[PDB]
Amino acid sequence: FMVSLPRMVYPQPKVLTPCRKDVLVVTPWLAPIVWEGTFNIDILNEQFRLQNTTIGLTVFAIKKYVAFLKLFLETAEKHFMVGHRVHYYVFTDQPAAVPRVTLGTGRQLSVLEVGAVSMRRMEMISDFCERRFLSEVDYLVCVDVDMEFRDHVGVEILTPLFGTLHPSFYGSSREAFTYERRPQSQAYIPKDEGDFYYMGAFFGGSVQEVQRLTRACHQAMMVDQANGIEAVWHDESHLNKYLLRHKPTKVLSPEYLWDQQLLGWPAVLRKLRFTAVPK
């Protein structure tokens, strides 16, 4: 049950004035594509705070990648779901290397130790922490650690299932996408199929939908392993196959996954929100 929004004063949306004319803001299956200028964050914040929404954020920091945690977490505190309930889940082989980061109120961090590559992330999210995530959070957001937040990443992303447009491929035609192209792989996508190329570094949704996605990808990766094949881009190849066959209910624009050193700051990006750190 959703209680009423309070009175709010904000600019009237105008039917004959688009928010953005330079980009696609809705997919052909009627999922919003999230760009700056498409959302009023005050309305969304109200809607999600009225539901007392809790967001879980999973991040893996294994071997040398523990070095990225301090900047990742400190910038998440500045920019990620501020004002909402957040539970960070840090999967690591080195619990003692997790930096002590000061958190805002209503935010918590759990260190989840894993044993000392390819299948780990999907397997861990789907086999290991199922009951815990279902009890503790409403949405799960699953991101790479070799990253920093530079600008707002908030409840505009939340939806039953989302993926994020890969920053190197958003202008590419589907035949150029680096999908798995061998029919012997479960991740196979023919050259005449595909909506978008989603990056493995930022996906999410409701706990149920994320567990479905990660379970399916893990099972598909296990089939490939049994058949002696490894998809060209590993879990990203499987993620792409899953999201082709199970359409996401929002798609995040490359504002949400960018590499400025590689790709600069194109006119189409009004904000760079979550960006690669050099490695």
Place this chain on the structure above:
Amino acid sequence: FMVSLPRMVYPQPKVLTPCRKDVLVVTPWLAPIVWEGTFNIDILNEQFRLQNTTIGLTVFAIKKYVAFLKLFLETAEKHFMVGHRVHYYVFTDQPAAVPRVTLGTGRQLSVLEVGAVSMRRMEMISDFCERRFLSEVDYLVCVDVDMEFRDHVGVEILTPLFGTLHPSFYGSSREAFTYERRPQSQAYIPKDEGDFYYMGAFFGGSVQEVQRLTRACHQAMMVDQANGIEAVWHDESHLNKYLLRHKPTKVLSPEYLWDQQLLGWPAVLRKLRFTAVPK
């Protein structure tokens, strides 16, 4: 649980090419606004057929308005949710005046007799047929009878909660909207509030959300009656108040509720789908 979509061949959506540049296609709360060119109906049909979706359509035909049923139903057979399961619910004071209309396979019609204005529709949808609708259909669509279908009205509209832009007000600023303006009415909306002016003639959603809306509107109308006030546009005024405080998850463009005699055929409408019949 949603099974996988099959392989499909269709045009690739292109991120740097909008579907429509002349209209707003997403609200500031990230609800799609449904216009021609924004959706691939083949993808949507697959998604909804895989769930074996059943759509209930409620229509009231009381007193002289029984005359509109033949054209309403015959054109609904041509254009409304064709290929999907449909259950028509015809509320009337004259069961014997309901025309015998031949239905396509997977479609059924029930005549629901009511006693021989203002509060009837919201009351009937919310108090009377609650358990029945919950058992029989997945979505409810609630429309005026003084109408005909001229073009496709399909699963692109389906969502937890939708309203439809009134054809006379889609270009209007909010101060011009004919919302109830007296603070003594439960339907009151001040001049600095409002997203859109929705028409009472086409709303819907999941059965649960439609029952919530109609219950709230009925209760609000009963409060007004007890206080000796009747909102300026009756149930439409209350519908507008509800949808201001409970944002719809899709908004239908005026393609879905048009009067060609009154308003012609503007460039912004590529299709006229559901249109007023003279009276």
